[PDB]
Design a protein around this nucleic acid. Structure first.
Ligand SMILES: [K+]
Ligand SMILES: [K+]
Ligand SMILES: [K+]
Ligand SMILES: [Mg+2]
Ligand SMILES: [Mg+2]
Ligand SMILES: [Mg+2]
Ligand SMILES: [Mg+2]
Ligand SMILES: [Mg+2]
Ligand SMILES: [Mg+2]
Ligand SMILES: [Mg+2]
Ligand SMILES: [Mg+2]
Ligand SMILES: [Mg+2]
Ligand SMILES: [Mg+2]
Ligand SMILES: [Mg+2]
Ligand SMILES: [Mg+2]
Ligand SMILES: [Mg+2]
Ligand SMILES: [Mg+2]
Ligand SMILES: [Mg+2]
Ligand SMILES: [Mg+2]
Ligand code: NA
Ligand code: NA
Ligand SMILES: [Zn+2]
Ligand SMILES: [Zn+2]
Lengths: 136, 103, 52, 76, 88, 93, 225
RNA sequence: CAGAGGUGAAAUUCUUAGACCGCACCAAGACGAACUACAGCGAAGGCAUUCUUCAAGGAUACCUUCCUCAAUCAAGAACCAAAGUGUGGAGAUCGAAGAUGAUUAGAAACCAUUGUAGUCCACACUGCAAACGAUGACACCCAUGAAUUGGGGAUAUCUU
């Protein structure tokens, strides 16, 4: 019913934005301009405890929910953009980034090009904490 | 009792007055840039198992075209460097060993 | 329309031919922000801080 | 080795490497040249020297001679 | 000899109006009675007549500017900006 | 500046005259060799002096300072708007 | 349901590229006084240069190009060049420690308007027989190098149209000329243009847009299945 | 389109009146990552984007000039991180005081969400620091091996 008018074997590309912090994981599929979104599932929509929203298992479940529904749209290939929190906070990606990308590949989607798009300042504002840091 | 000849940093007596501080990569404490422990790391996005799953499903990445990596310059305060095992306390004789290149 | 953007002005006409009604008290002025050639209008910052 | 070094009669190899004010008796480093009218030019000139055109260019060290005029070092 | 220690021209007020208000008014009082340099001609002969009005003893020229000083600091910036924009 | 160096040579070796009225007198005669005008000169007075120089074909130099600077550059303690050098001694200009 | 009211479009690139109809997108169908063409105009699409010039080799795989929609023709979206940039991984892998990094910014205007900003970068290298621990550069040579780059870019790009200027940047012609003429000043390990952005555009001209697109391949999105 | 944030775990807090997330923009105020080093400049305090501009400072080169004009100091003078004070601006970020969640026997603290004065600029004060090399200034002699920054002298490599 839906999907572009193409042959049954052609590839139609989307872009999936994977945001993985230490508190959650986002799996978000848009078109190649970013102005239109197809689906968006987060790790917090799959688990019941706050401490599991960033686990690799929750990211795996979110990705499968994305594939199981975007197949109706007619999208079957994805370019990948991954990011950490960035800015003045940490630049190391969260635990769920690895598991989310692998789940999409094993679910049937083709994988295009991969890039890291973490925000990087050329010079920054001051970050939270004192000059002594977080004393835990 | 003076423990180190360079006092734990890289500022000789008649070279500079002040070096601008930076925020610790982990806790955020301010440390002079010449004192903090710096490391340049190059990490792969995916481990060996995940990489082969992604590569087979890609018309782009394969034997000829490698996958991209992450590049980071990390600077730590002394407490965070010790707690993360980046450096460890050493016996008095061995404290003067220095390395100039990644080993 | 003939004054470059970013200029300092005084004795500004609110309406054409009014002979000057804005920025007249001692030490005051207005700042030109931008022009719109399609609409034929100009944006100003007033001494009070408002934009007109 | 095997040669005893006398302080008051240093060897030519040793004395040749010293700074001009660190020799046993200090002395100059510069000299005079003539170029070809014929004029005399200082080896470390810093002003402008004219023939009719400029003959040398000032430099942080020795002056730079123009190409197209022969030069010869004068004795003493 | 010197006739006062701290308050030069404010000594006409006696002990009345308070130390800080007297101090703030002294700086502007001194400025409005001094002689300022005249770019026309070459003399220090600019005197204020009324608020914002200055007249040169030598040039006999009248200039409009400044309540208590011949030229305000904000005016100097504006002249440079206008000159730069004209040269574009 | 190069002009200031020459003025000092003239001030000690040559002959000169200070003031607009005396400078014009030298221009009416033929003794003037160079006329220097400060940038702080009334516009109508400058135009009259320049007209005299054009008629008599006298070189004219526009000084980069005001009449205060021109007087200081001559070693004087007063202001001069116009300078005229009748004799140049041991100087290029 | 969302996709009960969406319609598919095609995004076509100017004639300088081999792959004309890259990417597809969706938009709401016209309802009432809200016109789809008004929303569509002005969107920016990003693609990888190796996919556009599929005949290109390996250096094109590290650059991405952006296009902005200017007009809607049936189910086709006609675009104009917007910007170009090196990928983050490629750029971050070029820095080494004991050398010096040199950066310049150049702003030029083409014949038909279209002001743009250039952002060049370069690195020093040791000589073949060098033994020193570093290859830092003198500041006087860095300034001289920056001046020569600015002069060559302004002179070259101010005499051409926007279409030809893109071809110079895309097909790796301008950078090679810069490297050849800048090595005599200072031995360079690498010189790249890392980011081009269009800052100001002229007034819209329908005929100018059509002359830049040649023959437009026909879209089949509006037909029956 | 239903959650997001935050933690060891949570809760104060935001959200179908559309939060979080995605793309291109607009405004304002700070700051100049990677390159950045037992490297450079400065009397000390201090000083990292580019172009234009103003006055300086040190080193080197010299068969230029001069001829004891010097070293170090009570009295006296100038400069001096941060916090603090006064009067005008500015107010993004962070954040003494204060507020609200937790933790705890208690917690006024450490942790979380916020937030006033401040943090930035101009002019005027203040004159204190682990203001440290915990090492006063000027001058002489003094063993060895690799380096490094700037200038100069003498004699196989690359680009043009
Ligand atoms: K919205
Ligand atoms: K050298
Ligand atoms: K050397
Ligand atoms: Mg601890
Ligand atoms: Mg030093
Ligand atoms: Mg200090
Ligand atoms: Mg250290
Ligand atoms: Mg070097
Ligand atoms: Mg949450
Ligand atoms: Mg930088
Ligand atoms: Mg302060
Ligand atoms: Mg204040
Ligand atoms: Mg205030
Ligand atoms: Mg806050
Ligand atoms: Mg707090
Ligand atoms: Mg309690
Ligand atoms: Mg110390
Ligand atoms: Mg002490
Ligand atoms: Mg040096
Ligand atoms: Na493959
Ligand atoms: Na504030
Ligand atoms: Zn730390
Ligand atoms: Zn006057």
């Amino acid at each position: 019913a839906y999907g572009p008018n193409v042959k049954k074997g052609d590839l139609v590309y989307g872009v999936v934005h994977i945001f993985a912090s230490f508190n959650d994981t986002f799996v978000h599929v848009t078109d190649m301009s970013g102005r239109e979104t197809y689906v968006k599932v987060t790790g917090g929509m799959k688990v019941k405890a706050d401490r599991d929203e960033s686990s690799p298992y929750a990211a795996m479940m979110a990705a499968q929910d994305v594939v199981a529904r975007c197949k109706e749209c007619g999208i079957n290939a994805l370019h990948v953009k991954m990011r950490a929190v960035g800015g003045v906070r940490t630049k190391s990606p969260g635990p769920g980034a690895q598991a989310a990308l692998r789940a999409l590949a094993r679910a049937g989607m083709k994988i295009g090009r991969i890039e890291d798009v973490t925000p990087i300042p050329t010079d920054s504002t001051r970050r939270k904490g004192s000059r002594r840091g977080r004393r835990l | 009792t003076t423990k180190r000849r360079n006092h734990g940093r890289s500022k000789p007596a008649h070279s500079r007055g002040r070096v601008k501080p930076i925020h610790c990569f982990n806790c955020g404490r301010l440390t002079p840039k010449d004192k903090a422990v710096g490391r340049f790391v190059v990490r792969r996005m995916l481990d060996a198992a995940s990489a082969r799953d992604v590569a087979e499903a890609s018309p782009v990445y394969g034997a000829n075209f490698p996958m991209p990596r992450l590049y980071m310059k990390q600077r730590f305060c002394i407490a965070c460097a010790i707690h993360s095992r980046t450096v460890r306390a050493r016996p008095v004789g061995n404290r003067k060993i220095r390395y100039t290149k990644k080993v | 329309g003939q004054i470059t953007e970013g200029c300092i002005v005084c004795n500004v006409e609110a309406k054409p031919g009014d002979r000057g009604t804005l920025a007249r008290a001692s030490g005051d002025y207005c700042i030109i922000i931008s022009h719109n050639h399609e609409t034929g209008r100009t944006r100003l910052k007033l001494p009070s801080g408002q934009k007109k | 080795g095997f040669f005893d070094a006398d302080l008051s009669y240093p060897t030519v190899r040793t004395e040749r490497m010293k700074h001009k004010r660190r020799r046993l008796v200090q002395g100059p480093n510069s000299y005079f040249m003539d170029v070809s009218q014929v004029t005399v030019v200082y080896s470390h000139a810093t002003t402008s020297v004219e023939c009719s055109k400029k003959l040398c260019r000032p430099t942080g060290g020795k002056a730079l001679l123009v190409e197209g005029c022969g030069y010869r070092r004068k004795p003493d | 000899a010197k006739r006062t220690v701290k308050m030069g021209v404010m000594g006409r007020y006696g002990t009345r109006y308070g130390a800080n208000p007297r101090k703030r008014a002294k700086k502007l009082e001194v400025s409005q009675h001094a002689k300022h340099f005249c770019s026309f001609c070459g003399k220090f002969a600019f005197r204020r007549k009324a608020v914002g009005i200055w007249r040169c003893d030598g040039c006999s020229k009248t200039v409009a500017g400044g309540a208590y000083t011949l030229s305000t600091p904000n005016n100097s910036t504006v002249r440079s900006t206008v000159r730069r924009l004209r040269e574009l | 500046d190069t002009i200031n160096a020459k003025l000092q040579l003239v001030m000690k070796s040559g002959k000169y005259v200070l003031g607009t009225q005396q400078a014009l007198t030298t221009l009416r005669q033929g003794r003037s060799k160079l006329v220097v005008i400060a940038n702080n000169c009334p516009p109508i007075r400058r135009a009259e002096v320049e007209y005299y120089c054009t008629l008599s074909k006298t070189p004219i130099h526009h000084y980069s300072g005001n009449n205060l600077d021109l007087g200081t550059a001559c070693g004087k303690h007063f202001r001069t708007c116009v300078l005229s050098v009748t004799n140049v001694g041991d100087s290029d200009i | 349901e969302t996709m009960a009211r969406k319609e598919w479009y095609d995004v076509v690139a100017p004639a300088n590229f081999e792959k004309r109809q890259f990417a597809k997108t969706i938009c709401n169908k016209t309802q009432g006084t809200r016109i789809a063409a008004d929303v569509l105009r002005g969107r920016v699409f990003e693609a990888n240069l190796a996919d556009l010039n599929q005949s290109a080799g390996e250096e094109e795989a590290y650059r991405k190009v952006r296009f902005t929609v200017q007009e809607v023709q049936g189910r086709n979206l006609l675009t104009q060049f917007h910007s170009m940039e090196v990928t983050t991984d490629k750029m971050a892998s070029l820095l080494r420690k004991w050398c010096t990094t040199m950066e310049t910014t150049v702003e030029v205007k083409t014949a038909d308007g279209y002001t743009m900003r250039l952002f060049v970068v370069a690195f020093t290298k040791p000589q073949a027989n060098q033994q020193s621990r570093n290859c830092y550069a003198k500041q006087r040579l860095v300034k001289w190098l920056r001046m020569r780059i600015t002069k060559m870019i302004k002179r070259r790009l101010s005499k051409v149209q926007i279409k030809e200027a893109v071809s110079l940047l895309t097909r790796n012609v301008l950078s090679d000329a810069l490297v050849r003429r800048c090595n005599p000043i200072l031995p360079l390990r690498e010189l790249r243009i890392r980011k081009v952005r269009v800052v100001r555009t002229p007034k819209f001209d329908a005929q100018a847009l059509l002359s830049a697109h040649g023959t437009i391949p026909a879209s089949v999105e509006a037909d029956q299945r």
